[PDB]
Write an enzyme that holds these catalytic residues in place. Sequence first.
Site, short mmCIF file in Angstrom:
data_model
loop_
_atom_site.label_atom_id
_atom_site.label_comp_id
_atom_site.label_asym_id
_atom_site.label_seq_id
_atom_site.Cartn_x
_atom_site.Cartn_y
_atom_site.Cartn_z
N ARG A 1 -39.21 -24.78 25.56
CA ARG A 1 -40.43 -25.56 25.62
C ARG A 1 -40.50 -26.35 26.93
NH1 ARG A 1 -39.96 -28.74 20.03
NH2 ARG A 1 -38.03 -29.26 21.14
N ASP B 1 -39.70 -33.06 25.82
CA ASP B 1 -40.37 -34.32 26.13
C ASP B 1 -40.16 -34.76 27.58
OD1 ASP B 1 -41.64 -34.83 23.46
OD2 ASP B 1 -39.56 -35.16 22.82
N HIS C 1 -30.57 -33.15 22.80
CA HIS C 1 -31.21 -32.75 21.55
C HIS C 1 -30.20 -32.82 20.42
CE1 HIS C 1 -33.64 -30.43 18.62
NE2 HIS C 1 -34.64 -30.78 19.40
N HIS D 1 -38.54 -39.63 16.70
CA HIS D 1 -39.04 -38.27 16.50
C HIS D 1 -40.14 -37.88 17.48
CE1 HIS D 1 -40.61 -34.70 13.93
NE2 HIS D 1 -39.76 -34.34 14.87
N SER E 1 -40.48 -34.38 10.76
CA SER E 1 -41.86 -34.14 10.34
C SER E 1 -41.95 -32.86 9.50
CB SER E 1 -42.83 -34.11 11.51
OG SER E 1 -42.47 -33.19 12.53
N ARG F 1 -48.15 -29.70 15.35
CA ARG F 1 -47.10 -29.54 14.37
C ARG F 1 -47.68 -29.15 13.01
NH1 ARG F 1 -41.73 -30.73 14.65
NH2 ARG F 1 -42.04 -29.54 16.55
N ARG G 1 -34.39 -32.68 -4.40
CA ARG G 1 -33.76 -33.78 -5.12
C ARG G 1 -32.24 -33.68 -4.92
NH1 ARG G 1 -31.56 -38.28 -7.11
NH2 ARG G 1 -32.84 -39.41 -8.61
C1 LIG Z 1 -31.94 -36.46 21.77
C2 LIG Z 1 -30.80 -37.40 21.34
C3 LIG Z 1 -31.36 -38.53 20.47
C4 LIG Z 1 -29.77 -36.64 20.53
O1 LIG Z 1 -28.91 -37.64 19.93
P1 LIG Z 1 -27.47 -37.20 19.38
O2 LIG Z 1 -27.51 -35.84 18.77
O3 LIG Z 1 -26.96 -38.36 18.58
O4 LIG Z 1 -26.68 -37.06 20.74
P2 LIG Z 1 -25.13 -36.74 20.94
O5 LIG Z 1 -24.54 -36.33 19.63
O6 LIG Z 1 -25.06 -35.82 22.10
O7 LIG Z 1 -24.57 -38.20 21.33
C5 LIG Z 1 -23.35 -38.26 22.10
C6 LIG Z 1 -23.40 -39.42 23.07
O8 LIG Z 1 -24.19 -39.06 24.23
C7 LIG Z 1 -25.24 -39.98 24.39
N1 LIG Z 1 -26.40 -39.28 24.92
C8 LIG Z 1 -27.04 -38.18 24.39
N2 LIG Z 1 -28.06 -37.79 25.12
C9 LIG Z 1 -28.10 -38.69 26.18
C10 LIG Z 1 -28.96 -38.83 27.28
N3 LIG Z 1 -29.99 -38.02 27.51
N4 LIG Z 1 -28.70 -39.83 28.16
C11 LIG Z 1 -27.66 -40.64 27.92
N5 LIG Z 1 -26.80 -40.61 26.91
C12 LIG Z 1 -27.07 -39.60 26.07
C13 LIG Z 1 -25.48 -40.55 23.00
O9 LIG Z 1 -26.21 -41.75 22.99
C14 LIG Z 1 -24.03 -40.71 22.55
O10 LIG Z 1 -23.43 -41.82 23.22
P3 LIG Z 1 -22.52 -42.80 22.35
O11 LIG Z 1 -21.23 -42.06 22.05
O12 LIG Z 1 -22.28 -43.95 23.30
O13 LIG Z 1 -23.27 -43.24 21.09
C15 LIG Z 1 -30.12 -38.00 22.58
O14 LIG Z 1 -29.72 -36.96 23.46
C16 LIG Z 1 -31.05 -38.95 23.31
O15 LIG Z 1 -31.03 -40.14 23.01
N6 LIG Z 1 -31.82 -38.43 24.25
C17 LIG Z 1 -32.87 -39.18 24.93
C18 LIG Z 1 -34.11 -39.33 24.06
C19 LIG Z 1 -34.85 -38.01 23.89
O16 LIG Z 1 -35.07 -37.29 24.87
N7 LIG Z 1 -35.23 -37.70 22.64
C20 LIG Z 1 -36.15 -36.63 22.29
C21 LIG Z 1 -35.52 -35.52 21.43
S1 LIG Z 1 -35.45 -35.88 19.65
O1 LIG Z 2 -35.31 -39.84 -10.34
C1 LIG Z 2 -36.16 -39.00 -9.97
O2 LIG Z 2 -35.89 -37.94 -9.37
C2 LIG Z 2 -37.62 -39.34 -10.24
C3 LIG Z 2 -37.70 -40.68 -10.96
O3 LIG Z 2 -37.61 -40.68 -12.19
C4 LIG Z 2 -37.78 -41.83 -10.29
O4 LIG Z 2 -37.72 -41.80 -9.06
O5 LIG Z 2 -37.87 -42.90 -10.90
O1 LIG Z 3 -36.08 -30.77 16.55
C1 LIG Z 3 -36.06 -32.00 16.29
O2 LIG Z 3 -35.22 -32.54 15.54
C2 LIG Z 3 -37.17 -32.86 16.89
C3 LIG Z 3 -38.08 -31.98 17.73
O3 LIG Z 3 -37.77 -31.78 18.91
C4 LIG Z 3 -39.14 -31.35 17.21
O4 LIG Z 3 -39.33 -31.44 15.99
O5 LIG Z 3 -39.88 -30.67 17.92
#
Ligand SMILES: CC(C)(COP(=O)(O)OP(=O)(O)OC[C@H]1O[C@@H](n2cnc3c(N)ncnc32)[C@H](O)[C@@H]1OP(=O)(O)O)[C@@H](O)C(=O)NCCC(=O)NCCS
Ligand SMILES: O=C([O-])CC(=O)C(=O)O
Ligand SMILES: O=C([O-])CC(=O)C(=O)O
EC number: 2.3.3.1
Lengths: 434, 434
Positions: B327, B373, B318, B272, B242, B399, B419
């Site tokens: 948080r 969350d 995360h 997100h 975002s 946000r 870009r």
């Molecule tokens: C937040 C999140 C998306 C981060 O994703 P990421 O950076 O790709 O996570 P990682 O790099 O640590 O992934 C490593 C592995 O651990 C897993 N993992 C990460 N957090 C996990 C959790 N809370 N529970 C279970 N498995 C988890 C991933 O799915 C991945 O498994 P894989 O190898 O089978 O694909 C991930 O921790 C998640 O799915 N959490 C639960 C959803 C959540 O709370 N999201 C809100 C924050 S954006």
């Molecule tokens: O290419 C760019 O950055 C902008 C543009 O001309 C398009 O998206 O068509």
């Molecule tokens: O940090 C991130 O990528 C997502 C998030 O938790 C936030 O924007 O608050």
Amino acid sequence: STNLKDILADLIPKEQARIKTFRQQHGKTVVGQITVDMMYGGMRGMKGLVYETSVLDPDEGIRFRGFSIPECQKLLPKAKGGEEPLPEGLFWLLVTGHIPTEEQVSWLSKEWAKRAALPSHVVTMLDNFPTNLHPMSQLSAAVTALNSESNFARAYAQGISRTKYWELIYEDSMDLIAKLPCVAAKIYRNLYREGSGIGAIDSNLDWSHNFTNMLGYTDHQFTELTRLYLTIHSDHEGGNVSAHTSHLVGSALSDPYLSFAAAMNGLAGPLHGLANQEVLVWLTQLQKEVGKDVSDEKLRDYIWNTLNSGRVVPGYGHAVLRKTDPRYTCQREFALKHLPNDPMFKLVAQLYKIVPNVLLEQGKAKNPWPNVDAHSGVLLQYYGMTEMNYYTVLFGVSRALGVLAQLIWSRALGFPLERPKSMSTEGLMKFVDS
Amino acid sequence: STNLKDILADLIPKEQARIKTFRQQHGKTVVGQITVDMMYGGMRGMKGLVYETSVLDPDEGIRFRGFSIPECQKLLPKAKGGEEPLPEGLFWLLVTGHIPTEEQVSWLSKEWAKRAALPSHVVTMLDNFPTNLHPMSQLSAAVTALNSESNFARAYAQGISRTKYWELIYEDSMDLIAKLPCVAAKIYRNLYREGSGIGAIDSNLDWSHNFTNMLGYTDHQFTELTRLYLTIHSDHEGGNVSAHTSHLVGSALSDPYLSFAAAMNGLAGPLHGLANQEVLVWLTQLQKEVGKDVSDEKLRDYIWNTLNSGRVVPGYGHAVLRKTDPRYTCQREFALKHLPNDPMFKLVAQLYKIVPNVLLEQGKAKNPWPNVDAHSGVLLQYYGMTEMNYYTVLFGVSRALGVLAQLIWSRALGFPLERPKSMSTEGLMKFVDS
Ligand SMILES: CC(C)(COP(=O)(O)OP(=O)(O)OC[C@H]1O[C@@H](n2cnc3c(N)ncnc32)[C@H](O)[C@@H]1OP(=O)(O)O)[C@@H](O)C(=O)NCCC(=O)NCCS
Ligand SMILES: O=C([O-])CC(=O)C(=O)O
Ligand SMILES: O=C([O-])CC(=O)C(=O)O
Ligand SMILES: CC(C)(COP(=O)(O)OP(=O)(O)OC[C@H]1O[C@@H](n2cnc3c(N)ncnc32)[C@H](O)[C@@H]1OP(=O)(O)O)[C@@H](O)C(=O)NCCC(=O)NCCS
């Protein structure tokens, strides 16, 4: 067969395998360096994302799945009585990597014709909007409100396999493409045709034609121009603001409607989708200042003044491109073929010769040659499409094709959330100092 | 004085000078490498942009202009009868780099109170929307339709110096922040309070309080929770979807309304802004499956099943963070302070102890600890905020503070169009092969 979804179902596994191997062998290969200036300079020249549908080569311009616009002009199916490539076939190319048959394109025109109906809440929203709400705002709002219709959004909340994501994304994308001319045309009619009805979709017409019909035009050559316009604005790689925005929002698993509406908010920005209007406004000031008929000598001195004032010549230059834009070239061809004695076009032609040399001497330019926006306005205006505020809507309807093509592939290939790391100035200074 | 715009006018030149020098000395300094895997992997770990308002440190979590949430809890002005920091002061911090006085925050509450009125076309749009249109869609659409009110959009089309951009961006940002609780509250009332009026803005109340009043709540501790919630969700660096979307669309000189609405479309994405809801849904299934009262031993076995099924534990992990989220911590403090005998909270507390150890053994996790969350839903639900679809709206309103703070600075510092360069798989393979 002629069912795109089945053909795409066959292509995807092959591409997944290819990418998996390539990452296993070359995942850790360095393909560029990030400098402080790139971070401050909008990631300029940073290799940032993978985007399959189109690749902008700095010297030759855009390739759609490795095909040039000339190649596309020759190979892509045209309407029966037409010479201009149908945007349907372009979308087929971007999605499949293959030039479609006539029958494939006919099948696609029919598909989009059957999916085009607007839900009544979106008709109501559009009909209630005031005339002082910009057409690009109206588009984006309506597309966002269309998310009610999303297959993907609904299915995701019920828990759906990752492997089935692309299918629902396909369905939504086809639905959105279908509805977009209806949305776009309702805006046009509500703003400039006193709110008259957009009339019927004809199931035996191509997308561009149903669109020009709903816009309230009948001139065959306008439909031809629209086919061309919608084809060539369809995609410009992944790094432009509207493709990238669609890509980023989509990476959070926002549905096609949300991802596209966010892209439209980016295309609405002056520095992305307003150059067409800027050019026309500049040409109009030009004539006003030096006269509607001019020799090439006066015209050369005006450019200089423009530049000495510290103002750009709109429609010349590009962020990444470094030669004449093939999207420009192909509009020129259309013009000198269909309206060569158009006074405004002649000015556009005149500037083609003169402006390049200037910009060179000035130095600062990188690309002294014209982009697509140098040429689109005079074509549209020639056929009575005079409402400049609306022009970016046409661009938007075009750009759906490329960005949604790629969205399908991003989900099929399981591209993850886009999440670079940011830094502050203070943080980046300490980082550098150690 | 107490006029933020004047204080910001004084800060900007200094920051421009600092950045100009730093680019002159270190523009060409390499701060990281781009690999094939980063391009396929959503720019993971790529230093991609400069974002001044907040910096997410992997080990300690978020700093607002170098201040921690504990520091913010202690230093930031509170409402008179309150203990929770006012989001007003957070916005002041992000904009100025300085902790505001009480009087600065009082001045800001009054400013936002006076700018809050909705144009009638947006009231009409909102009142006409069906109940099955998702609250995040309603928000984004309405914010886009608000662009009618944009100072920046209007002034840009009339030709305005680059140096004056930030001023109009400030004006629009303050206007949008002001109106956002009204927009958000109209959605809430239209969806869940049979379309009752949002009632009056009180010029002597802080933003969060006017917001909870328009939402139709009176519980003082809900207002306190809202102040906390709106403060801590305000900014999370520049790389989240975002913030980045706001940043990208804004870089094309889209006005604050368009940039924010595009950000909302990104926050609406499951990956997100939906984790809060996912957590609550998961906790509910939990109780359903093993019972509303449980010992810590059963609870430990459920996690394992979850994981063996190949499903995540929502609210843990995360993208960049690698320790407990501050948080999260500060919501816990609020809970055990204000609702410690809440059954759902107890489950949340229980999971805190158990879940971390699991995820460790599993291995795959990087961050085995909770994010924000994990904890937001039970607080909101405790106070009667039970409409889970609406939760991401609260996040969105929060946000705005961070993303608009930064938007002002991006325009003041003259950050250019974002870009990057994209590549196809095919193109990236040939690139690597030479
Ligand atoms: C937040 C999140 C998306 C981060 O994703 P990421 O950076 O790709 O996570 P990682 O790099 O640590 O992934 C490593 C592995 O651990 C897993 N993992 C990460 N957090 C996990 C959790 N809370 N529970 C279970 N498995 C988890 C991933 O799915 C991945 O498994 P894989 O190898 O089978 O694909 C991930 O921790 C998640 O799915 N959490 C639960 C959803 C959540 O709370 N999201 C809100 C924050 S954006
Ligand atoms: O290419 C760019 O950055 C902008 C543009 O001309 C398009 O998206 O068509
Ligand atoms: O940090 C991130 O990528 C997502 C998030 O938790 C936030 O924007 O608050
Ligand atoms: C397209 C455009 C924005 C590319 O910007 P860019 O990549 O930053 O351009 P460059 O890197 O070549 O900039 C080098 C210099 O040449 C100038 N320049 C570039 N194109 C120019 C043009 N057509 N006329 C005058 N000056 C131009 C730039 O403003 C800059 O001058 P500066 O050093 O005083 O700041 C730029 O060429 C432009 O403003 N063109 C006119 C608007 C237009 O047609 N835009 C539509 C395409 S997105």
